[PDB]
């Protein structure tokens, strides 16, 4: 249920701001950083919302005005779309599938141009949607460097050390409009998802529901995204989507969601909730142990399936031949 803001300021959000879907969910635990149950969840690679990390405490003052004045004059990747879904597509892989035409268009612009183009849309009451997704780098201004240095690195660095993870891969700044949706997908890295402004509904599915979410081919630009349209699921093509069960939560300013590697997640900015701001922390997972302990975890099988598809695309000399050969291997033999 919705949490209540301090000072009797009412519920931060209500159920009417959530989109409706066909599957059931149960809540992700919201725990304190000092709760041993939170440490045992991160250790067992299960999601958890940490409410009091102070991970991005200096950034909780961030808004469009503050950022525009201090985030520098670097280039920011801004995506536009006529729909609320911002399906990710790997541009490097668009050569393999010359028939894929993205629904989102990427435009590289300055931050003040992003704010202005967002102002125009609001002014003219247009229905275009924008989503800024840019990796933080050296080009940021002094005040943002101060904020960045003010994050609680003492806490997240200990997490990195306790779990044997690799190095921090990147920090992605996310600024989207109310109603924006990032369709279900899984990342190969560990992710700490630090909410700053606004509220986001996060629906996670464990790796063992691979069969229910039907990822695109590895060589397809939408590699690691689900093929299922959550708004209009095609049960004829994707019958096991009727068996999907998610883990749900709504994160607000100060909350940090641990999204374990290979876990699916569907993210949506709450309807009529204003703009959302997020910063995520990606870490390379711990190395694969030398002695493999059976039975294999679900994510290890996903890793195996990915490698088979990759090798097959390399050996055949064309990723388009992957499907035909795989079907030839199974039809009347393993099915
Ligand atoms: C883009 C982001 C989701 C979102 O907040 O829209 C995500 O996949 C991640 O941080 O891992
Ligand atoms: Zn992700």
UniProtKB/Swiss-Prot annotation:
It is found in: Nucleus; Cytoplasm; Cytoplasm, Perinuclear region. Substrate binds at residues 138, 167-169, 187-189, 224-225, 286, 307. GO terms for cellular component: cytoplasm; cytosol; nucleoplasm; perinuclear region of cytoplasm. Changing residue 330 to R: No effect on dimer formation and HIF1A Asn hydroxylation activity. Gene3D superfamilies: Clavaminate synthase-like, Jelly Rolls. Changing residue 187 to G: No impact on HIF1A Asn hydroxylation activity. Loss of Asp hydroxylation ability. Strongly stimulates 2-oxoglutarate turnover. Loss of HIF1A Asn hydroxylation activity and slight stimulation of 2-oxoglutarate turnover. Its EC number is 1.14.11.30, 1.14.11.n4. Changing residue 187 to A: Prevents suppression of HIF CAD activity. GO terms for biological process: negative regulation of Notch signaling pathway; negative regulation of transcription by RNA polymerase II; positive regulation of myoblast differentiation; positive regulation of vasculogenesis; regulation of vascular endothelial growth factor receptor signaling pathway. Its cofactor is Fe(2+). It catalyses: L-asparaginyl-[hypoxia-inducible factor alpha subunit] + 2-oxoglutarate + O2 = (3S)-3-hydroxy-L-asparaginyl-[hypoxia-inducible factor alpha subunit] + succinate + CO2; L-histidyl-[ankyrin-repeat domain protein] + 2-oxoglutarate + O2 = (3S)-3-hydroxy-L-histidyl-[ankyrin-repeat domain protein] + succinate + CO2; L-asparaginyl-[ankyrin-repeat domain protein] + 2-oxoglutarate + O2 = (3S)-3-hydroxy-L-asparaginyl-[ankyrin-repeat domain protein] + succinate + CO2; L-aspartyl-[ankyrin-repeat domain protein] + 2-oxoglutarate + O2 = (3S)-3-hydroxy-L-aspartyl-[ankyrin-repeat domain protein] + succinate + CO2. It is an enzyme of class 1 (oxidoreductase). Pfam families: Cupin_8 (PF13621). 2-oxoglutarate binds at residues 131, 182, 191, 200, 280. Residues 1-37 are annotated as: Disordered. Hydroxylates HIF-1 alpha at 'Asn-803' in the C-terminal transactivation domain (CAD). Functions as an oxygen sensor and, under normoxic conditions, the hydroxylation prevents interaction of HIF-1 with transcriptional coactivators including Cbp/p300-interacting transactivator. Involved in transcriptional repression through interaction with HIF1A, VHL and histone deacetylases. Hydroxylates specific Asn residues within ankyrin repeat domains (ARD) of NFKB1, NFKBIA, NOTCH1, ASB4, PPP1R12A and several other ARD-containing proteins. This is Hypoxia-inducible factor 1-alpha inhibitor. It comes from Homo sapiens (Human).
